[PDB]
Design an enzyme around this catalytic site. Structure first.
Site, PDB file in Angstrom:
ATOM      1  N   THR A 244       2.234  -2.179   5.616  1.00 14.95           N
ATOM      2  CA  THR A 244       1.466  -1.023   6.070  1.00 14.95           C
ATOM      3  C   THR A 244       0.036  -1.067   5.550  1.00 14.95           C
ATOM      4  OG1 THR A 244       1.848   0.512   4.218  1.00 14.95           O
ATOM      5  CG2 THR A 244       3.614   0.285   5.852  1.00 14.95           C
TER       6      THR A 244
ATOM      7  N   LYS B 229      -7.284  -4.762  13.908  1.00 18.13           N
ATOM      8  CA  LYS B 229      -5.869  -4.500  14.135  1.00 18.13           C
ATOM      9  C   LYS B 229      -5.297  -5.363  15.247  1.00 18.13           C
ATOM     10  CE  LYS B 229      -3.886  -1.613  11.389  1.00 18.13           C
ATOM     11  NZ  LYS B 229      -2.694  -2.150  10.684  1.00 18.13           N
TER      12      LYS B 229
ATOM     13  N   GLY C 109       0.840  -1.184   0.000  1.00 12.68           N
ATOM     14  CA  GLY C 109       0.000   0.000   0.000  1.00 12.68           C
ATOM     15  C   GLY C 109       0.877   1.236   0.000  1.00 12.68           C
ATOM     16  N   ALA C 110       1.868   1.238  -0.887  1.00 16.52           N
ATOM     17  CA  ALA C 110       2.952   2.217  -0.858  1.00 16.52           C
ATOM     18  C   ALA C 110       2.492   3.657  -1.081  1.00 16.52           C
ATOM     19  CB  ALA C 110       3.995   1.845  -1.897  1.00 16.52           C
TER      20      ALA C 110
ATOM     21  N   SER D  22      -7.504   9.563   9.197  1.00 16.45           N
ATOM     22  CA  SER D  22      -7.030  10.326  10.348  1.00 16.45           C
ATOM     23  C   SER D  22      -7.124  11.833  10.106  1.00 16.45           C
ATOM     24  CB  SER D  22      -5.591   9.935  10.686  1.00 16.45           C
ATOM     25  OG  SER D  22      -4.709  10.244   9.620  1.00 16.45           O
TER      26      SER D  22
END
Ligand SMILES: NC(=O)c1ccc[n+]([C@@H]2O[C@H](COP(=O)([O-])OP(=O)(O)OC[C@H]3O[C@@H](n4cnc5c(N)ncnc54)[C@H](OP(=O)(O)O)[C@@H]3O)[C@@H](O)[C@H]2O)c1
Length: 315
Positions: A79, A157, A8-9, A195
């Site tokens: 990630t 998570k 997921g760069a 976020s």
């Protein structure tokens, strides 16, 4: 001059990880859904991308696609992950996707260390936790409490991390985890992530009030730096909490009102009747011991608004 993989760069936290990696002479294999989609345009213009960035086509649930990207690499930074409270697209895709990476890196055969990106959702979510105790790495969430309150991102998570710890031990690959809190800072990617949405909802009038709650904060660059430090440090092991400080909702909207009074930031609280929740003690000594100087939240919140404006997200 080594080779590493980053899943997921072209994500919020990931895009910063690639920049730092590319800048230190690392070959970065970046897994994305579609290497030639415009979403990744902000990765092919970095100091080292043309020379050492390789965008690999791979979904996270495509085991073979992962192995293609993970193969030939001395390290891996997992990630990529869903960020949502929908458990159907969060819980199982996270545990399966994570377990695929560990196996793939374990499968063959150059990877000396994998770095998983867990979350604070697998740490501070436990109402049985006392108010006096210092939240450190040995703190885990109450999975039942997450399920009762539909906190499925925190659930996923937690399970995805414990699955990674298991999978790593079962296959015998070196693992080390980084637990970032609510991340904030400048956005390299063109899209607004989860976020930043918590920050931006104060600056566009989406919220006329703020909740009576607390949360920890960290800069996005402090995170990207953490992943790179915990990887290069040979003795690095265990979990690694990644935060600068704990703030109340009020303290946040104050800082934004402070530096940006032309915006309709909230002032009134949703409760105003019960005692305001006090921030909790926490430890970030493991990362500091690795010589990490955290950027202040206020400094990081400013670069965000300045970044959002420059990129049209804010007027
Ligand atoms: N940002 C924070 O405050 C924070 C805090 C704690 C932990 N984390 C964790 O840090 C990691 C990255 O977070 P982030 O801020 O960078 O979020 P993000 O940018 O919004 O998403 C990261 C990348 O993961 C990709 N992805 C998700 N599911 C995928 C799948 N099945 N197949 C292929 N790609 C997939 C996403 O692609 P698509 O957009 O196309 O779905 C996205 O590019 C995550 O594990 C996150 O849970 C973040």
């Amino acid at each position: 001059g080594q080779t590493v993989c980053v899943t997921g760069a072209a994500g919020y936290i990931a895009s910063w990880l690639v920049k730092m990696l590319l800048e230190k002479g690392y070959t970065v294999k970046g897994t994305v859904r579609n290497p030639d989609d415009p979403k990744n345009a902000h990765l092919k213009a970095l100091d080292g991308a043309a020379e050492r960035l390789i965008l690999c086509k791979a979904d996270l649930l495509d085991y073979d696609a992962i192995c293609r990207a993970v193969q030939g690499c001395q390290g891996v930074f997992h990630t990529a992950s869903p960020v949502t409270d929908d458990p159907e697209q969060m819980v199982e895709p996270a545990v399966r996707g994570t377990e695929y990476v560990i196996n793939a890196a374990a499968e063959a055969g150059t990877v000396r260390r994998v770095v998983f990106t867990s979350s604070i959702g697998a740490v501070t979510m436990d109402p049985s936790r006392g108010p006096d105790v210092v939240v450190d790495e040995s703190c885990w969430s109450d999975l039942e409490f997450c399920k009762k309150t539909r906190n499925w991102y925190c659930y996923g998570k937690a399970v995805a991390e414990q699955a990674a710890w298991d999978a790593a031990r079962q296959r015998g690959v070196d693992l080390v985890v980084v637990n970032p809190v609510l991340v904030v800072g400048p956005l390299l990617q063109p899209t607004v992530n989860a976020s930043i949405a918590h920050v931006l909802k104060y600056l566009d009038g989406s919220a006329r009030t703020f909740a009576n709650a607390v949360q920890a904060y960290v800069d996005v660059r402090d995170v990207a730096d953490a992943h790179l430090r915990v990887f290069e440090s040979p003795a690095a092991s265990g979990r690694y909490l990644c935060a600068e400080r704990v703030l109340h909702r009020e303290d946040v909207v104050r800082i934004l009102a402070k530096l940006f009074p032309e915006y309709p930031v909230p002032t009134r609280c949703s409760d105003e009747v019960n005692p305001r929740k006090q921030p909790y003690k926490f430890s970030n000594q493991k990362l500091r011991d690795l010589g990490l100087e955290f950027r202040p939240v206020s400094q990081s919140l400013y670069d965000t608004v300045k970044n959002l404006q420059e990129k049209g997200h804010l007027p």
